[model samples]
Target: DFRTPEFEEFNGKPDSLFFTDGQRRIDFILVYEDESKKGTNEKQKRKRQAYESNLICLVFVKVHAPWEVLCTYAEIMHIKLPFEKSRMNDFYNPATRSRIVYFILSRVKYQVMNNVNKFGINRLVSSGIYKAAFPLHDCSERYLLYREWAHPRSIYKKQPLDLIRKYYGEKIGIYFAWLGYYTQMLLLAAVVGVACFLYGYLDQDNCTWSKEVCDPDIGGQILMCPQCDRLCPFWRLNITCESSKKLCIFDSFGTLIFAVFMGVWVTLFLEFWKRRQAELEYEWDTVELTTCGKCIRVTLCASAVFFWILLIIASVIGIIVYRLSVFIVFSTTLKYLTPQMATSITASIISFIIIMILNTIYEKVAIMITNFELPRTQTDYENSLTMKMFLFQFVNYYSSCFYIAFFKGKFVGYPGDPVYLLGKYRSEECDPGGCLLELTTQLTIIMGGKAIWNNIQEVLLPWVMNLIGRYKRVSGSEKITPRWEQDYHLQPMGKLGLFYEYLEMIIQFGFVTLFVASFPLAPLLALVNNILEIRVDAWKLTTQFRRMVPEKAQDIGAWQPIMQGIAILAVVTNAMIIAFTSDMIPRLVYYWSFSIPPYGDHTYYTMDGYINNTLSVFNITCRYRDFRNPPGHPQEYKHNIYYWHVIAAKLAFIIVMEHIIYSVKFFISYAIPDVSKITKSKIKREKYLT
Candidate 1:
């Protein structure tokens, strides 16, 4: 076999982004096999051969576009180059360099034979002809970014967003900007959230209902009926003493105010993000940048997404059955594990595992569905995919939380005649403390587990792959490998690289907004996670992965509407949580309406005997958590006036809270313009001068 002469010799020079002649800069690198492997296809070989014959060469093809080629492609792509007499920076930054190179790579045509035309490195890479194609990272800029931006020591410092845009491109640069902005807004929410949590902590002793539930004389003597069927035994009410005390910290008055604050906070977050996006548009010069398919096709795609979401709901129902079935076993066998505690904790973990598994399965399904829909442009494809993915992921991640918040314990009938799932398993019930605590537990497990798992995957996968790659390509000689060869040892950033990043953050946003009323500390947890997220993403981009082709984007395309939808929906969820999931509304109704002369022995409205009042007597010897007539009353075991009163109050609270928060949200959105005046004036000035 004869070797190529160029591959036979090497000049003793340092590795850099250039050819051996040092006159032409290598804009892109393409790698391929020698057509000898069994995996190699003849069709791919013919395509590559014809494509290279047009303007290229090599297994390690060093693509260098001449001056004319760059200019011609720039004009054709309509790339925004620096104008004359503009602010000072290099004429061709790395952003522009990679964009132009990628343009050529995607558009260059290959004529294999007789009017059959094929094109694009993307297609070659996808079809298995080219192993990889990417722009080389500039060592100096990468080192600078690592030192100043990505290093752990720089976590508290501001991001060098301008430098990132200069090196990476506008698309990635805008992602960081939005992430940083979100983190900053989270700090405010975190502060208020922590304050609300601390208020509850300090006022825990004042929770009279919790105290009554913990009192030995009151709660210890109360006997409650079995939660499940024949095997379940009666329980003592005082056993929930510890859980009730803990619940006092989350289901308090402060939680109500915090819920309202968060509604306003989400509104502020969205409105301000619009302003920030506009500023970036002006700064990055992206100021100037769909389609109804056949209704039947769209209907089919939507129905597919809906079906998957329903599948997730079905999984939630399955988990409910598991809890019901497992409770009897835990109650009988595990003495220390209270049935409620054991069921909730174990069920939450299982739910989290299922959520993760379904996410993986659905990711593949989503891509397949999107490809089937067949959007015309890459942007359309991503947007279509975004809507589908978010819809599915929203249900996948939040279904359990929703179950805990709204559905759990709601349908569990009074102990004598309990509701059953599938005519076999008893419907699951909440702890004596209410479902708010269970919701907090569920949110903590899912959010914490998701953050930890994602971080491990993001940090470990690429590093391990890069290590294996370097090991396979180890050279015994001391001579330095060329820039392309060295970069080939690095990991490739996939086509949907930034997409996962956006998805992760948007899911996080949902957690911080949707069920925030039950867990005031969700925002604080998110803030800490995001601080680390920013640095991890930055470090990975700067050091671990190969440089991605720079693409232009005007904004966070479909995510804006997605977030706005979440913001609007947050008010209802939080208000409903405070009204129904939490014990706040019931407690308020009891204090104001029932704890007086008509319903209580006390002269003034007070919480004394509140526990006994709320727990209706089931029989002569047993009681249960419901509002109904006591045993031997004229209307025995029937709904009481107090129940109707409380329902009225709960509905009124939801209406009042939603109205106030929505009013403020509308005002804030109206007051705050999407584009700031300064940014508008700058656009005007630029237009005038041009």
Candidate 2:
């Protein structure tokens, strides 16, 4: 009872003997009556609407105090025990450097019930709000903490208090355990560095080689034959006659070593990821900000940086391994091999793997750089670029010389054919040298196409696989969950999925054709198409092909590498077109440029006057030939002239038309003029007159 002697002074001063006997109950009813109107969410509404009818807002209230209670507004803010508003607190935000707050019902009444009895009679002590008026006074106003305190916590977020126990609940112990493990992993990263250093320094026994291999220098440019060894380490049939023995390590033991190191590195990285997942689940499970999950995510994020550093170490190892293997194992056998062997099988594999791991690590850095969603954004597309660049180098490098490793024979050899029929005696008299030249030319040309067969398989095929894998990965996705839609992305390739997308280049052909047709004639169509293509591509990247492009900088990096590939392809295509122009051009009128090689003229007609005059007026002041062909040619020839003129006129037109469009736009911008303006033309202008 609140009838102690301390209340005797105010007790007699009050009209109804101090605070009224049943005032608390009257205030409670008024609170219910006042909050009987608010919102309706099924669970919250059903519980609260026992008082509110309007459902405009709903506040859940409760009390936890027992003391000489003030029934006034001050009492509403501060109450005696059995009336503390602690149960009403909802900690939605942080509340550090302060005390807890208590919220009361302002919405619905029934939602205002409490479980103070659930914690027993110490309700006044547990409210977390301690002020001057016993429990009614506010502490430091940690209203945000009030929100956070209400949230649940995660176990994975904080370290388990007992690593070996089932029910460790101490928060501090867990934090240290987590910190120690993280520090330990960082120490482990040094292991990779040490392993790499040891590997770099290791000298295999003489039995490991047919001959010792030379060390490739730092820049890897010094040309020296790779130390040759015909010894096979994996075999039992030893070539015992030699002093040296080992052969082919890049593909065998070295790769295994790489895989092991990489796997360890990947596992640590993945563990951090797993921890993050666990913690997030925990955070969601507990409504508290300081729960375990948030801690775990931070931990994973923190350790992931080291994982990336480890990845870099692994990548460096990959590069060195690739270089060592290519130099040693491939030395006497084949180092100069092209698309079929060298870079793709050698440089590209190492570089590509390095990039793959790096890109994977970069996944976490997405928010800092650019937020490219998973599955759609960073699938094999980004990783595949390393393979593509390798392929390009493959095709170009092995353009004519890819058979050194595949087909076991020399390029120049006698065929069992017509050459024999010409006979040895009559060879000199039959224009035989020309015949020989013709034979060689035909052989080389045919070989040229087949040469790239190895190119296609070793180079193009893998790059294509890069595309395929990206399609598969994004659609197929990984185990990243709520972070990634692992299943939805991995639709069947034959469906409107990865496989179909792999072939989208065909659909893109339609776009390409449209662009080409529109390019010269209606240049704006091409420009618009380019912009439209960018937006469409970006949209698909954001939507349909979401994870197809990586957003962060990595091995080859974001869309930049792909864009660079396109640029190079464009340059190659242009060069090829120029090279093959003779074959493409139909015989007709002939014209020659000052220096460029030529086929005959195009079109049957002529613009002799324009052509002659243009040639006569052409300036040749520079020390090089002016490439303009005389324009007195056919309409087709006029296109070339027109193309040149348009190019030349571009600068002038940009300057001139901008003003025209700007002036019209400025006037158009004033779509409505002020009615109060007294200009005579205002009526005519404002009335929408012609």
Candidate 3:
């Protein structure tokens, strides 16, 4: 071992070595250091240096060498290395990808020790990107994969509306962003009402809060205008003595156009918002992710679509029939149940069951869609599922209100031989308007009450149970932890259910926008509710609720379309209000625009005191009076308008208004860019870097 080799010059050298067979050779340069304590021999000296330097070696594999041979040699040497980083290295199979990721993550440090998951979830504590070098548990009872607590000195954002965007990012911030914007936009309407109130536009010179807004008596004189009692005398407006029961004051025509403008604006906002959301989607890399990777034209299964069609049709018709039956039974006969109470009770019960059933079905349908076509990403699967659920919920939430608003009142009784004890044509001058009022009140109650109920069940109940359990344990002598307090399934709903808040917000938005003329304070009320709603929902998410599996979302999924759909419906609803709910048309005809009926100043009451009671026939037989008496050959044109004419006119108004709103929205949505210059620049920068 101490002797130098004979015959060869390099063989005697201390730095020379080789592994060889007769036909092939591999070389190794022996290395050593004098820094080690004097080893007895060169071999011991070389071993110390090799350990210190980690025995790093550069090697060349022969062109003809088999992969198996190279791998076998490397394995024997206790080394493993990746030759190249490629797309193939990432597991394509979700199962395999998850397994590998979980395996590696569980063994590493995932969270920084600050508990930032409480507020700044999926974000790291005080450190730069270098913190990624240290990881904690892959998954947690709290934070997401590889996420950490926010740094103590960082994330102190206090600017108005900046905190939400700073902490939550643009994805969720966009909703609040637009909410604030819309609130500012809607303030104009609110200010107009303030003007009305100050001008005593609704005051009949008699003090009453609901004097002008609500109808006074069923089918009584419906005054269209209430004006200023005392005038400026110079710029003089309507100084006429006003009827307090009028629907609108100051300017009915202005209010009419304003309502229509709001409808169109809603459509524009929603359509533009879709484009806005698309910009965000692209920036966030979710467009392809949510649409299924490498998305192609996904032609839906016609048979499957047809099946859903039949199912929805059947559901709508059945509910309609059921509601109609309830309406008929309550409005007629026995005093056991009033129309309002019966409608409310039955609707609540049916809605309760239907909502629960739909929720359950929503999950099953989600799974079906995921399986229907295999998704390339989690977002794709969720989007596909969410798309189906949104469709159903749109119908489900609106169905009862629709039944009460448009159905029972409009569809009841035959053409002229009217079966119901209501309308001008029906015997005895009865009215369905009173019944409509009752249903409207019930609808408002149902919608608001449902929201209160859900919040209680989801938030208050769990919190109460947990508090009680904790108090019991602390008071008692048990050394072990209280099992009740630690239960998993009893945890409050979290991020997965946060989307429901948005859905509920949309519903509330629809109510105020579509029907607020009837209940003018709806928007103001909703504004306050949403203010508390955002905080309450945030508190629950951060404190009481179990963390969701930190889902990646760029915006409110499937909700944009719902908002757009509501906008379309809002046009129709507002038009119907102008045509049928208000006294604008009658006021215009009688007071200003058109000639009065034959019995102009005479009160034409139905025959035999039947105005207050049911009767055999309608008194006025003026269907063809206008036809019989030619123009200027006026033998007193005794014409009375039918309910059908009003309905037909309302329908035509709805069609025209909706068409105008949609067409304008579609054109404008694309003509303008959704993303701003700054946002675009930033997105482009991110794209370049990535």
Candidate 4:
């Protein structure tokens, strides 16, 4: 018989155990005794003991786990797993659990992670099995559904796409398709980063290590580089630049170009996906089951105003309170606490509270509408609920992004010589504009740490709690299945709960697309997190939690709009960084300075010029540089341009780029039909015949 360790103490074995469950223990028999290696001599006696230890017959009992979960884990661990229906399910019972039933552990070695031959059974049962032992199953109708999916005919031989669509259905298959496609988008960033790195690598070779170069116009004026006319590698140079001007990072021209492409990509990607979603919906016949609000209510606002209007007003108050609380925290912390650390922590907590309150408000409103106004279908209620939450998410999540990237500096003064609270360690250099690099690094680390902490809460902590609860059940310390177990069984996770997961991913992707230039490897980090996300979610759904009821849908529901909003937001974010935040325009103005005197005294004149044929519509450095007074001291100089020239040019470029992208997207939508001709014909024929 077997049980989890019943004992714990100091200087004790951590994984002391034996083969299989107690119910399945094997009978011991000594078929023969080896006399040649017997303890006749000291060396031979020890060899015989080693031989006895080495010859082991492990009666491994099988354990069953979700096939998909196993496959996901295999990818993480760099192992192989069978995916063909038959091989995937090769053996199972279904009714026992959705992702779990029972396992045979038919073939296990003393090597899951290479070594753990002794005192490893507990580790094997915990972390060890989490990695090592593969899941499989048996023949019985108890797991009829499991067997059908896992050991179906032609499991290994079917087309990959066909297999995915067949097993997961059109909805989940489409979700994975989107993930795969989005991951593919990272290649552009990767290529850009590589080019930037290489250019810097080469430019470093060309530069003569000297600031002795003069401004030629003024004899004593020193410049960052001797020659500004030669080819420059500004892209790569931005990576290591900090306090000094040794790496006189060129105004980011190519950076703007990169943003242009990214903007177009994010914009078109969202648009194209809409068409794809349409096509998939057509194929799946995903019914728009929600009753139209206007059709049902006959008005935007319900006939009764008391319920929703009060909640709406309260929601507005909640948001205002959240923002005000955060602003106060930021202002108060600036005087006594580290400006960056205090604001980030305080804002996040406040934002979390706001979302919770907003979600509660959404629920109340949905229930009231359903009961009082009464939609024809339940889906109308679902759609109404989704709409309220999405509105809250947009304001709640993106507010922090806008504040941190732009407003925080204005409010608290730039965190010059920023010391990240993540480690309480400050950099020595005082980058005048504050370090975008350091800020992005902080962002990445925090994102990753949060993901890790949440996963532990989701998977490991719950698992540990269940173990404790089970022990209590055995010990009679408590009764009636622990709350955690009961909740796990009662509500599992529904499609509604899945929205948060999707929302997290959207945020993570935002960090990459929006700030990748600041921290080039953000996409790579995101990739790693996503890999874990797929598997961890799979594992949780299959083994640890109760199964959810399957629901038919045309699309990912509210996530479509949330993601589409994110995609569009990404474009705005990248454009802002390029135009206002980046040095692209400033550098361009500096490079093409021959036509200055282009401004008047206190003149707020605005002229818009397209920055290439790409788009329509389109920095006051108050610190003036003067060599007449002192060296390395920037004093004011009589100059023709104000800060607005650079700002105007950058804004113009962004406006034009967005319009062009939008026009292109608009044309492409019609150019490619959502449904293929063949599919249309099939639908038409079926409809007429019926």
Which stretches of model 4 miss by more than 4 angstroms?
1-171, 187-254, 271-378, 408-431, 446-450, 474-491, 494-497, 512-520, 594-640, 667-673, 676-690
Q: Write the per-residue lDDT of candidate 2 for residues 279-381, one digit (tens) a residue.
A: 4223212122156876666566545434544444444444434454554444346422322233224454444434434443443353332222122223453
The C-alpha lDDT values of all candidates are 0.77, 0.26, 0.42, 0.42
Candidate 1: tens digits of C-alpha lDDT, residues 286-322? 7442355566787787786678778888998888877
TM-score of each: 0.92, 0.19, 0.53, 0.50
* TM-score, predicted candidate 1 vs. hidden true structure: 0.92
* Candidate 4 residue lDDT tens string, 1-690: 122122232212212112223233121111112233245445432322332232222112222234563444333322111211122223331211222221112122242234435332223333322212222212232143233232324232222333334334444556545555555566555566446534544554222111111112322222122111123211111222222122223222334445555555555556556666665555443543156865556454444444454545455444434544454445444432333335445555554555446555654555565445544434555566455444444444444444445423321112121233244432122122233432443455546655675677667754766666566544543343222223332223432445555556666666666654344445556655655554555445444544332234566666677666665666666666555544445545533542233322223322122111111110212111111122223432222233455556778867875677556655665576666555666566644664
What lDDT score goes with residue 238 in model 4?
26
- Note each model's CA RMSD in angstroms: 3.6, 29.3, 19.0, 19.4
Better candidate by TM-score, 3 or 4:
3
The parts of candidate 3 lying over 4 Å away from their true place are 1-162, 165-258, 267-377, 412-430, 434-439, 461-498, 513-517, 548-552, 576-648, 659-673, 677-690
Order of quality (TM-score): 1, 3, 4, 2
Model 3 lDDT on a 0 to 1 scale: 0.42
What does candidate 3's lDDT look like per residue over 186-303, in tens digits?
A: 5555565344434445443332212321333531322211111122011111111122223234224444555655665565556556566665554433321157542432445324
**Sequence-dependent TM-score of model 2:** 0.19
